[PDB]
Design a protein around this ligand. Structure first.
Ligand SMILES: O=C[C@H](O)[C@H](O)[C@H](O)COP(=O)(O)O
Ligand SMILES: O=C[C@H](O)[C@H](O)[C@H](O)COP(=O)(O)O
Ligand SMILES: O=C[C@H](O)[C@H](O)[C@H](O)COP(=O)(O)O
Ligand SMILES: O=C[C@H](O)[C@H](O)[C@H](O)COP(=O)(O)O
Lengths: 276, 276, 276, 276
């Protein structure tokens, strides 16, 4: 009384996330916590800014101000320090750990080193680790070695690496920076939206691209930037300031979600925002 | 223009999952993928039976028969062989890996060894690893050593261990087996429901208890068993046969979820079942 | 304006704890958490019985029944499983970890293996690790290798090992067991009190000896036993049953303390007991 | 005849020490030796100044001058050289080890490297390790890397790291330095008290803050500084000069204790001081 269904042969189910179709199960599994498999996109809440800036505006009290936002994000991005101290583990939300540092606003910005061992990233149950690359800066070379080192250690263990292009802010520059990062082995690339040519940044990059929010904009313009980036091929957005510095952060996030996951237009999204 | 809210002191948020209030963030984060933080409970779909039994009834074709069930479970439990081969990583569901084996139905049941390295559990992004303890059996000693080994390795890396009490099936026996396992350091205990005294099994165990389904019962009796176990303090149920051997598995899961998470009565749950 | 006090030469302060005068700082510091430096003695509350016995009488609920006792003890002894789950780290009391197991009441008693790595002992901030030696039993050989292995690992790390003589219960037997253990390198020995010859067990053993409580006695007889052991040169007592199975455990501990640290007579101690 | 108390469910006891609610048992246990669990505060006696200064005033003879003070402190802070040579292990007091060095008063101050391996901190049974961060200095980068390194190694082992903000001495500067250090993962931060805005330093830092004494003040002014820091949210004080350079060091410590643990006013405390 057993049924092997020998008339229906077993068939592999393809993994579609851009450029991640030849990774081991664990790594694909981690990537699937970050990018929703249905939509292939992500809404990321970043609040790691303190790692070289100290208590920056809006992030003075993560425990009070930012904690109510966690549930509305797909994925959290922050440092192990903030994570252990004030992000309740019961939050049950994927985390990308900031894994570079040792710079500050008082010195050369690009002077970064790896700021956590893979050992501890694993211990914290990260989905990914993140480092800045600074093409064109004084410490460009070290910043790439940082990526190299994370990818080397990450491959032993199934942990994806995210390279973030730290900084002329034009297409040919980001194309350079994103492509080198990808070519060194980063599975995720975070960069900035650009008025013209962003399409080419995405096209020339073989792995998922996520955009950073940049400085605080009026809510409707920020939603336009999201709309454009998504429309032009970005795999998600990672806002900070544009969310945590808004007067209605929860509403903003709902709007961003509509744009990113549900193909909402910039306008409808803004009206969704206004209704909270 | 910064607000530190110095009139409101920072306060730690308690972690309430039974017996897991003193573990590191990463370990508490993995336990929070398994036990829903709101309810403190879990519905787990087990299908590792193949590890010593071969193609058992209902599990001849995981890829066809079981795959549509994944989305309805809180957590999956299986071996690394099934995981890589036929569980699509896009499933985006927590997994507990079977980490013991090297026995079969053709020999002494209790003759198990560790069947995967922690190295690989981490590579697969597990939430926990599971092994059998066989108190009272010929290879009792080795079976405990297996737990000791996994706990040792798991603590280096933030990986919870689940001890499963393999097998007179009464309260004093299970009290013995569960308590030894917990005492040796397992963070989760899986055991069987018992007609009388189950409350004591729960009370005498300092960490979360999940019950196994056992042999196929009529759906309404299975739901009674769940209800009783939950009512008497179990932190979750881990059915296999009672789900994948039912004629309406998806319906049975929804029913089990109502009992486990939503305080439904056995009867209401059965009616919920009947409406699919 | 500096004063080097060149007229008064620096002088080393001797460490007096029996046979521990040639250990490194860290190991001596850990031993000093256990044995009060003023008196050279310890009151230890043991509740690791579960490790091979399951929920034993008095230890069904450590969290309710035993937790109120912690503050009255010098040092706690238990398993890592109990420690992480139900001993609040805020207790701020030195712990000795049970580091052997994989035996049970349903099989050969002496069949023990090392039950925690030194790695995790250090992670838990233990003061010492304990294992049973079973001279005369079936698995005598393995049990001494257990001690050997912990002492080897403990010397790398400054962790003291306590050997426990598990079981004819006479002087010549305990002299054999305690001396072998010490000769292998254990820094602390736990054994049983004996009607006659106990003085010789102490004299023939070059390191501190602590006595186990044994089965429940009437409070006054238990206090006599302590009195005798301390009088005859024991460095402390480690009661379990005689404390946690008493009707007035807190009172019993205060009595035990008076005998052990303050040279109270058996009688006075019993009256001290009666006044709570 | 067993009582499981099935009518009273097990309940986790919360750990309240600011921002240390998600750490493993051993790390919480080490932190509880430092910060009294009742009050959440600490009085720390620091005498590590020798590490880059040689025999500084008051510390010419630790063995004579400082030894009688140990018993009145909650926790000792010094180097491993001092600890092994002249701190008697029988002192039975928690120690925080200075773990940075290789600078001196004859060269650039911020040129520090890690001065002891975690291996040896464990060997010494420390409760924490400490190192200087020098935001804004020439070797700022290396100094952060030192913290990173200690946290990485500390996490493997359950050892908390204390970052000390070495040095314009205003709020916005210490906010930067404390927050970066916390963000990199230090569990304890030691900084200086500031005339204005100290409240904000505390609020913006997600982990415990302890203040350094600074240069010798008249006893009553020193007690005012304590009172203010504690009142504004500091978790403790770590005096050196203000204690060991006073004419009545034991009296001063009792006064500091009254301020720190018992809510004494600056005035009462000074009168308490005067009465020895
Ligand atoms: O160095 C990167 C930034 O500080 C943030 O972590 C993020 O990547 C971009 O900033 P925002 O989210 O505010 O736009
Ligand atoms: O050895 C354990 C079993 O094979 C299953 O993995 C499970 O733990 C219990 O069986 P069932 O879910 O069918 O009740
Ligand atoms: O195997 C040793 C025992 O179980 C206890 O840990 C203790 O060493 C002696 O027992 P009791 O304290 O009850 O006398
Ligand atoms: O570099 C730090 C100092 O030398 C001391 O160790 C301490 O942290 C602060 O100095 P004081 O206790 O004298 O105020």
């Amino acid at each position: 009384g057993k049924d092997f269904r020998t008339d229906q042969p077993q068939k592999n189910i393809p993994f579609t996330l851009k450029g991640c179709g030849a990774l081991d199960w664990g790594m694909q599994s981690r990537l699937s916590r970050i990018f929703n498999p249905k939509t292939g996109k992500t809404v990321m809440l970043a609040f790691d800014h303190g790692y070289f800036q100290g208590p920056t505006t809006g992030l003075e009290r993560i425990d009070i101000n930012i904690a109510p936002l966690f549930e509305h994000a797909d994925v959290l991005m922050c440092t192990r320090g903030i994570l252990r101290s004030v992000v309740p583990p019961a939050t049950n939300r994927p985390v990308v750990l900031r894994a570079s540092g040792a710079n500050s606003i008082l010195a050369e910005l690009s002077n970064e080193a790896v700021a956590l061992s893979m050992d501890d990233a694993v211990r914290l149950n990260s989905c990914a680790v993140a480092a800045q690359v600074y093409i064109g800066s004084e410490y460009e070379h070290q910043s790439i070695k940082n990526i190299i080192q994370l990818v080397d250690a990450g491959m032993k263990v199934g942990m994806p690496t995210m390279a973030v292009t730290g900084v002329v802010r034009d297409q040919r520059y980001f194309s350079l920076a994103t492509r080198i990062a990808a070519e060194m082995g980063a599975q995720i690339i975070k960069t900035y939206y650009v008025e013209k040519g962003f399409e080419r940044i995405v096209a020339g990059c073989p792995v998922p691209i996520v955009i950073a929010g940049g400085k605080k904009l009026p809510e409707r313009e920020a939603l336009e930037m999201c709309w454009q980036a998504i429309d032009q091929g970005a795999s998600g957005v990672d806002m900070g300031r544009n969310i945590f510095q808004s007067d209605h952060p929860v509403a903003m996030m709902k709007a961003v979600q509509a744009v990113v996951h549900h193909n909402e237009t910039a306008d409808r999204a803004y009206e969704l925002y206004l209704s909270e």
